[PDB]
Design an enzyme around this catalytic site. Structure first.
Site, PDB file in Angstrom:
ATOM      1  N   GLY A  77      72.916 -60.333 -58.625  1.00  0.00           N
ATOM      2  CA  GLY A  77      71.843 -61.185 -59.090  1.00  0.00           C
ATOM      3  C   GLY A  77      72.351 -62.492 -59.678  1.00  0.00           C
ATOM      4  O   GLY A  77      73.551 -62.763 -59.735  1.00  0.00           O
ATOM      5  N   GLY A 134      64.872 -58.833 -60.177  1.00  0.00           N
ATOM      6  CA  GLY A 134      64.570 -57.855 -59.144  1.00  0.00           C
ATOM      7  C   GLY A 134      65.818 -57.418 -58.402  1.00  0.00           C
ATOM      8  O   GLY A 134      65.978 -56.243 -58.064  1.00  0.00           O
ATOM      9  N   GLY A 141      69.104 -58.005 -59.841  1.00  0.00           N
ATOM     10  CA  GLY A 141      69.822 -57.420 -60.962  1.00  0.00           C
ATOM     11  C   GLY A 141      69.384 -56.012 -61.328  1.00  0.00           C
ATOM     12  O   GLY A 141      70.219 -55.174 -61.675  1.00  0.00           O
ATOM     13  N   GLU A 158      59.622 -57.947 -66.605  1.00  0.00           N
ATOM     14  CA  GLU A 158      60.985 -57.516 -66.915  1.00  0.00           C
ATOM     15  C   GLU A 158      61.046 -56.188 -67.664  1.00  0.00           C
ATOM     16  O   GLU A 158      61.989 -55.416 -67.407  1.00  0.00           O
ATOM     17  CB  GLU A 158      61.700 -58.619 -67.701  1.00  0.00           C
ATOM     18  CG  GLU A 158      61.613 -59.918 -66.971  1.00  0.00           C
ATOM     19  CD  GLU A 158      62.853 -60.798 -67.062  1.00  0.00           C
ATOM     20  OE1 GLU A 158      63.630 -60.670 -68.047  1.00  0.00           O
ATOM     21  OE2 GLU A 158      63.038 -61.631 -66.128  1.00  0.00           O
ATOM     22  N   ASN A 218      76.507 -68.093 -71.433  1.00  0.00           N
ATOM     23  CA  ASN A 218      77.436 -67.315 -70.630  1.00  0.00           C
ATOM     24  C   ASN A 218      78.881 -67.456 -71.092  1.00  0.00           C
ATOM     25  O   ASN A 218      79.647 -66.489 -70.999  1.00  0.00           O
ATOM     26  CB  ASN A 218      77.286 -67.706 -69.166  1.00  0.00           C
ATOM     27  CG  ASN A 218      76.053 -67.103 -68.552  1.00  0.00           C
ATOM     28  OD1 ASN A 218      75.420 -66.248 -69.167  1.00  0.00           O
ATOM     29  ND2 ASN A 218      75.700 -67.537 -67.341  1.00  0.00           N
ATOM     30  N   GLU A 274      89.533 -44.312 -70.587  1.00  0.00           N
ATOM     31  CA  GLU A 274      89.667 -44.338 -72.030  1.00  0.00           C
ATOM     32  C   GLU A 274      88.425 -44.926 -72.698  1.00  0.00           C
ATOM     33  O   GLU A 274      88.126 -44.572 -73.847  1.00  0.00           O
ATOM     34  CB  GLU A 274      90.919 -45.109 -72.424  1.00  0.00           C
ATOM     35  CG  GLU A 274      91.621 -44.526 -73.631  1.00  0.00           C
ATOM     36  CD  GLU A 274      92.820 -45.346 -74.050  1.00  0.00           C
ATOM     37  OE1 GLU A 274      92.906 -45.743 -75.237  1.00  0.00           O
ATOM     38  OE2 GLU A 274      93.679 -45.591 -73.182  1.00  0.00           O
TER      39      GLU A 274
END
Ligand SMILES: Nc1nc2c(ncn2[C@@H]2O[C@H](COP(=O)(O)OP(=O)(O)OP(=O)(O)O)[C@@H](O)[C@H]2O)c(=O)[nH]1
Ligand SMILES: Nc1ncnc2c1ncn2[C@@H]1O[C@H](COP(=O)(O)OP(=O)(O)CP(=O)(O)O)[C@@H](O)[C@H]1O
Ligand SMILES: COc1cc(-c2ccnc3cc(-c4ccc(C)cc4)nn23)cc(OC)c1OC
Ligand SMILES: Nc1nc2c(ncn2[C@@H]2O[C@H](COP(=O)(O)OP(=O)(O)O)[C@@H](O)[C@H]2O)c(=O)[nH]1
Ligand SMILES: [Ca+2]
Ligand SMILES: [Ca+2]
Ligand SMILES: [Ca+2]
Ligand SMILES: [Cl-]
Ligand SMILES: [Mg+2]
Ligand SMILES: [Mg+2]
Ligand SMILES: [Mg+2]
Ligand SMILES: [Mg+2]
EC number: 3.6.5.-
Lengths: 440, 54, 351, 424
Positions: free
Chosen positions: A10, A144, A146, A183, A228, A254
């Site tokens: 996405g 959609g 993602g 969402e 980001n 781990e």
């Protein structure tokens, strides 16, 4: 050495993936064309950076990455962008019609026609892997693609690679940023279909990242690239132990051993300090004690919630920069006296610590000032269940009127998957409340 | 407060501090699910084309 | 125009604050589950704190402190007092108290409890106790009998020292308790309301049969019903501070502040400053205030004892008007702008 | 990406022509299709509405439909008339006489296949067609009757594209014939079934705006169409200019339409402009765009509840101030937004303002108050139908009274469905 493949799905997963790989290159001293001067064994190796980059005879260092978007415009900017050279064309995969904010359209309708192409491009990367541990999956909850395509991908990766671990980095939807009214539907739906295929998942609430950029970076209206690069710092903190010499979180398994004792409750809370603006003229560097303390302010968590009203099951501190064990334990000592930190009875009250002496690297022209020490804490606390309460409540309001439902059915989904998904979430909320609260 | 399994190297250190001790579906099942949705789609499209033919 | 919602309608006090807010002309009430409020006056149980502070462009405030119930349930308060170092096992204003889990449920103190009992039995000390939880109370010096009674009811109960020598007001030779209303605002200021009340017994105190419980239980409900002398000396069996002051001046030659109030303010301060790190909303994305009711007993040496803290108190009828205006003033309009009836409780001694 | 535009009938072509005139002037493209602007943002999404031609001229992806040649000859002669691909002029000769039946069943049927051939040749030329927009009125015969016939055929051939319409509603205040309530009711039923989003443009509201607030005393169709050009430009901003939001109707449809038949949007515009100089602040744009007097559908928003809202701010301004102002109509009027659709107001912004303004706002409301428009049309319809008045014009072309009874039942249903969610 064991290799890790990152999968970005996405818009949110791709643009965040770009943020990460930019940062990884800066950190390992790889330049935009893939050359790594400091890499002295040319055309091969098994150093720890090799878990994320592979090597070509000409000396190019190539991300073990696939990018997947059902529409081209976002990955095209990868193909034309300043890191064009670093990725093989076969690792950038586009459709031409996206999933229109519709889980069902990304899963069922457009998913079916692209899933096999993606799995084989994924398999071309797994074939240059002498020992694969599994996958890092980047995606938004609310898209959609993602949401819907990822859960389809996650189901089959479990089949095609059933002994491998799968970690996610999930953007949780926030109206200040979010792209859509449905969402909440997409989030509940894909959490329900991915829950058993994901060994450990790091949620990032777009609301928390946004507010951290406004308050601590003095950005009045943060962009995606603002958001980001900050997310990228936190992800790189979480993954540094796979790319660098160390003994804590050395492989993907781990991460589940150390952070996920109950496998359904696999959502560690990430907290990160300090976030300092590069425009800050005069700044007083923060100490080990100050930045460890900042790990217990909600204002620094990737998901706003209140760990005081929950219980811990696990806790790591990942330090970067000028940190030594004695200062950590002194900071930990002072903090446990002044703060509500209660563990579940069947876990030790304790911290696994990791220090890497290289301080966070900052993207040139970024918004983050360089600091002498930073820490990312990873605490598996039941307080993160607040985010599920929020999501589920929004889902309940709309579904009580079947609002928007017709869009999903029209893609071939059956109404009953809504109620199944919502009942799974009802279980998950009660699991959290069992572990993390004792009787009134 | 016990400080245990200390590990050092040139990149950093790692250890564990303790303040207190304790008190999947098939491939065929997936592509059948994907095909059942595809037929529900192709049915609703035939119901529309039948309505448009009327 | 600030906005608010109401999710406890059985609340005498926030019913009045709702109407006081409307009358301002600057507050509009939304419907229960409208999320776009400034202020939540929420439910008593299952208040959804996890949903506050996530509405862009809305400062949100609720009238309850999440986690404040560890002060307001009898079992929790005991556990809080003996485990917190600031309150201590060695706490001079709390009656000796032990948590007791019934037999069906199988921590619990019940065998550490009768250590104290038999040390008292062969110590020849007055040793009446009282069993209670969060109406089903038994006062007896037979330990052998009180663990009998806890286990036939199914809830967790605490057994506490009974204050055998209480201060008794004359005329009447009669028991009482004191209720103070304290407001903690979003800044964690602690405000004591200047008016308290004495909830009187109107039965002379009888120290030889505790099985009759109406000279021993000063609850306004039980006096309204069981007691033959309800309304006898004080209106509503409620004595206010001006009277109780001058009675102390005439009868005992002190004042209310010196004899009792200093001790009360020390207990309020100590309880709320203990749990402040656990419930403060100072750096949180929503804010809290809460009104509490503290209940004290006075023994005959004028020592004050805390018996319980109540987190959803009703007010006394005469005082609703003034207290509820005070809540809007310092809890609500402090956050949403449009001589005090509160004593701020602050002390910073150096050592 | 690409959208295919269709304009049908007298009203569909006049508004359609001035739409293309307005947006061609925004994008710098001159009457001969030759580009002449100063920014590359004018060209970045130009493909959504334009094909690139020989010499990279820009040609609108537009088909012009009428059953008579009058109005389309006026378009070929008009300001931008030569912009249009001449093969895309499709016309009969006999007209439809303001008769739905002629548009949909007799005269219209003869020409509809030749319109669908030009549609097909415009979609084949499309890298990835996403859907169609039709401009038409509902009160005449061609745009009403043939327009909905075309909408039916296009759905048959492209059942998975988005169908989008700008539909002028009839008003006794601006009226050509008595049979408009008949033509509109027949058309509304088609629209409920066969379009994904319909912009209800009420000639009633366009008149009152022209009269009460622009203070034009005798409003022409030219004055009405100025308002229509301005708000069509505004709603299509995301389709034509670079932004955070991509140019696709499906995401808009998904987020605006909670129940499939409730896809009739109430549009609004601010500042209301007649063909001045004062700076409009962001608080003013916001207050006006939500003002009943700026709605292009003569319904009172305070009589209903907003299911969803989309708002589009154009110009140089602080989106912090935009964010604040949007958040403060929703938080100070939370009564009028359904509580069961969280965060149901979405706001987009574009740096480029329309011609003649430095700051504008376009409002797109899916309010239950739109029922008032349909009840109005329904009362006018019933007042004639209970006497079968004027029916002969329709039975003359093959229709039966039953089809009228069904169409009025369907609209009364649609009104009941709006009311169900105004009380939910
Ligand atoms: N932090 C961050 N969030 C993003 C980004 N892009 C989108 N989001 C958020 O993700 C949600 C939208 O999902 P997208 O990733 O854009 O949807 P998609 O996967 O492209 O799916 P479709 O476009 O519907 O095919 C919203 O809540 C966005 O705020 C990004 O680059 N960074
Ligand atoms: N250790 C003790 N010693 C002496 N009297 C006690 C006592 N514990 C309780 N009491 C008496 O019992 C009465 C009420 O007991 P309790 O603490 O359970 O209040 P309650 O919760 O039932 C009503 P409210 O919440 O309004 O106070 C007190 O007023 C007091 O007279
Ligand atoms: C905002 O105006 C427009 C928005 C879009 C667009 C593109 C991509 N995603 C989305 C989501 C929503 C949305 C709408 C309403 C709600 C409540 C929530 C979300 N709209 N939208 C397209 C547009 O082009 C035609 C457009 O102009 C009208
Ligand atoms: N706003 C506006 N309404 C129009 C225009 N032309 C017609 N109308 C209305 O449209 C109805 C008649 O439709 P018309 O387009 O002339 O019929 P057609 O050519 O047979 O499709 C009536 O409601 C007219 O008021 C116009 O140019 N602008
Ligand atoms: Ca090498
Ligand atoms: Ca697995
Ligand atoms: Ca003919
Ligand atoms: Cl495997
Ligand atoms: Mg996308
Ligand atoms: Mg009580
Ligand atoms: Mg005409
Ligand atoms: Mg033909």
């Amino acid at each position: 050495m064991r290799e890790c493949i990152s999968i970005h799905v996405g818009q949110a997963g791709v643009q965040i993936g770009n943020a990460c790989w930019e940062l990884y290159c800066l950190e390992h001293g790889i330049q935009p064309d893939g050359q790594m001067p400091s890499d002295k064994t040319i055309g091969g190796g098994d150093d720890s950076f090799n878990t994320f980059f592979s090597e070509t005879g000409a000396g190019k260092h190539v991300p073990r990455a696939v990018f997947v978007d059902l529409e081209p415009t976002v990955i095209d900017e990868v193909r034309t962008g300043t890191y064009r050279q670093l990725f093989h064309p076969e690792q950038l995969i586009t459709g031409k019609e996206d999933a229109a904010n519709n889980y069902a359209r990304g899963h069922y309708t457009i998913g079916k026609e692209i899933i096999d192409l993606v799995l084989d491009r994924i398999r071309k990367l797994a074939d240059q892997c002498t020992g694969l541990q599994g996958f890092l999956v980047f995606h938004s909850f609310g898209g959609g693609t993602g949401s819907g395509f990822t859960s389809l991908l996650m189901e089959r990766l479990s089949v095609d690679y059933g002994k491998k671990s799968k970690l996610e980095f999930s953007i949780y939807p926030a109206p200040q940023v979010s792209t859509a009214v449905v969402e909440p539907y997409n989030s509940i739906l894909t959490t329900h279909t991915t829950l058993e295929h994901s060994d450990c998942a790091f949620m990032v609430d777009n609301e928390a990242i946004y507010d951290i950029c406004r308050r601590n970076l003095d950005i009045e209206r943060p962009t995606y690239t603002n958001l980001n690069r900050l997310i990228s710092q936190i992800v790189s903190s979480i993954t540094a132990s796979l790319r660098f010499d160390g003994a804590l979180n050395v492989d993907l398994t781990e991460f589940q051993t150390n952070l996920v004792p109950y496998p359904r409750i696999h959502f560690p809370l990430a907290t990160y300090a300090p976030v300092i603006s590069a425009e800050k003229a005069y700044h007083e560097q923060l100490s080990v004690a100050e930045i460890t303390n900042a790990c217990f302010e909600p204002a620094n968590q990737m998901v706003k919630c209140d760990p005081r009203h929950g219980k811990y099951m696990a806790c790591c501190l990942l330090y970067r920069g000028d940190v030594v064990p004695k200062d950590v334990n002194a900071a930990i000592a002072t903090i446990k006296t002044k703060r509500s930190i209660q563990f579940v009875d069947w876990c030790p009250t304790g911290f696994k610590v990791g220090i890497n002496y290289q301080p966070p690297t900052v993207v040139p022209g970024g918004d983050l000032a360089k600091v002498q020490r930073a820490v990312c804490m990873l605490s598996n606390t039941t307080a993160i269940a607040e985010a599920w309460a929020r999501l589920d409540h929004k889902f309940d309001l709309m579904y009580a009127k079947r609002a928007f439902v017709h869009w999903y059915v029209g893609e071939g989904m059956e109404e009953g998957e809504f109620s199944e998904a919502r009942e799974d979430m009802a279980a998950l909320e009660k699991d959290y409340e069992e572990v993390g609260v004792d009787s009134v | 407060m016990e400080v245990i399994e200390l590990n050092k190297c040139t990149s950093g250190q790692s250890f564990e501090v303790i303040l207190k001790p304790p008190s999947d579906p098939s491939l065929e099942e997936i592509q059948k699910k994907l095909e059942a949705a595809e037929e529900r789609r192709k049915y609703q499209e035939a119901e529309l084309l039948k309505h448009l033919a009327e | 125009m600030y906005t608010f919602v109401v999710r406890d309608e059985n609340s005498s006090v926030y019913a009045e604050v709702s109407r006081l807010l409307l009358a301002t002309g600057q507050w509009k009430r939304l419907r229960k589950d409208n999320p776009r409020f400034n202020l939540m006056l929420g439910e008593r149980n299952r208040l959804p704190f996890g949903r506050l502070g996530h509405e862009p462009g809305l400062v949100q405030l609720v009238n309850y402190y999440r986690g404040a119930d560890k002060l307001c349930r009898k079992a929790s308060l005991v556990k809080l007092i003996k485990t917190s170092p600031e309150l201590s096992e060695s706490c001079t204003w709390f009656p000796e108290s032990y948590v007791i889990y019934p037999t069906n449920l199988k921590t619990d103190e019940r065998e550490v409890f009768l250590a104290a009992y038999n040390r008292r039995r062969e110590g020849r000390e007055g040793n009446v106790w009282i069993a209670k939880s969060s109406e089903g109370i038994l006062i007896s010096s037979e330990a052998s009998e009180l663990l009998d009674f806890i286990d036939e009811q199914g809830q967790v109960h605490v057994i506490q020292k009974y204050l055998e020598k209480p201060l008794l007001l004359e005329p009447g030779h009669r028991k009482f308790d004191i209720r103070s209303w304290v407001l903690v605002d979003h800044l964690y200021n602690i405000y004591l309301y200047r008016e308290g009340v004495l909830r009187t017994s109107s039965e002379p105190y009888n120290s030889a049969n505790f099985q009759d419980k109406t000279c021993h239980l000063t609850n306004h409900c039980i006096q309204k019903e069981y007691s033959k002398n309800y309304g006898r000396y004080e209106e509503g069996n409620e004595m206010f501070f001006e009277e109780f002051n001058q009675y102390l001046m005439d009868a005992l030659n002190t004042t209310l502040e010196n004899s009792i109030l200093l001790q009360i303010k020390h207990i309020i301060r100590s309880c709320l400053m203990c749990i402040e790190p656990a419930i403060s909303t100072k750096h949180l994305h929503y804010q809290s205030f809460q009104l509490f009711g503290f209940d004290f007993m006075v023994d005959e040496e004028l020592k004050v004892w805390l018996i319980e803290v109540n987190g959803a108190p009703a007010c006394a009828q005469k005082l609703y008007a003034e207290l509820c205006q005070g809540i809007v003033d310092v809890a609500i309009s402090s956050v949403f702008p449009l001589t005090s009836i509160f004593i701020k409780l602050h002390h910073h001694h150096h050592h | 990406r690409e959208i295919v535009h269709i304009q049908a009938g007298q009203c569909g072509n006049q508004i359609g022509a001035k739409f293309w005139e307005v947006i061609s002037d925004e994008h710098g493209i001159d009457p001969t299709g030759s580009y002449h602007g100063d920014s590359d943002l004018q060209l970045e999404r130009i493909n959504v509405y334009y094909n690139e031609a020989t010499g990279n001229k820009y040609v609108p992806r537009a088909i012009l439909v009428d059953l008579e040649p009058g109005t389309m000859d006026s378009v070929r002669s008009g300001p931008f008339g030569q912009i249009f691909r001449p093969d895309n002029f499709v016309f009969g000769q006999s007209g439809a006489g303001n008769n739905w039946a002629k548009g949909h069943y007799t005269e219209g049927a003869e020409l509809v296949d030749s319109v669908l051939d030009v549609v097909r040749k415009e979609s084949e030329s499309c890298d990835c067609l996403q859907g169609f927009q039709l401009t038409h009125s509902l009160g005449g015969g061609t745009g009403s009757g043939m327009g909905t016939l075309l909408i039916s055929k296009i759905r048959e051939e492209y059942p998975d594209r988005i169908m989008n319409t700008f539909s002028v509603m009839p008003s006794p205040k601006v009226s050509d014939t008595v049979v408009e309530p008949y033509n509109a009711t027949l058309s509304v039923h088609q629209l409920v079934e066969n379009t994904d989003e319909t912009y209800c443009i009420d000639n009633e509201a366009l008149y009152d705006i022209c009269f009460r607030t622009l203070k034009l005393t005798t409003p022409t169709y030219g004055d009405l169409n100025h308002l229509v050009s301005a708000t069509m430009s505004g709603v299509t901003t995301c389709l034509r200019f670079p932004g955070q939001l991509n140019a696709d109707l499906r995401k808009l449809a998904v987020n605006m339409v909670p129940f499939p038949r409730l896809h009739f949007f109430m549009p609004g515009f601010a500042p209301l402009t007649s063909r001045q100089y004062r700076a409009l602040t962001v608080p003013e744009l916001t207050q006006q765009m939500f003002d009943s007097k700026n709605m292009m559908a003569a319904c009172d928003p305070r009589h209903g509840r907003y299911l969803t809202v989309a708002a589009i701010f154009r110009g140089r301004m602080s989106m912090k101030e935009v964010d604040e102002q949007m958040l403060n109509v929703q938080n100070k009027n939370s009564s009028y937004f359904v509580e069961w659709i969280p965060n149901n107001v979405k706001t987009a912004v574009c740096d480029i303002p329309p011609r003649g303004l430095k700051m504008s706002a376009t409002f797109i409301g899916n309010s239950t108050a739109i029922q008032e428009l349909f009840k109005r049309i329904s009362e006018q319809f019933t007042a004639m139908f209970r006497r079968k008045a004027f029916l002969h014009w329709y039975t003359g072309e093959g229709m039966d009274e039953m089809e009228f009874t069904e169409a009025e039942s369907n609209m009364n249903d649609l009104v009941s469905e709006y009311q169900q969610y105004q009380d939910a």
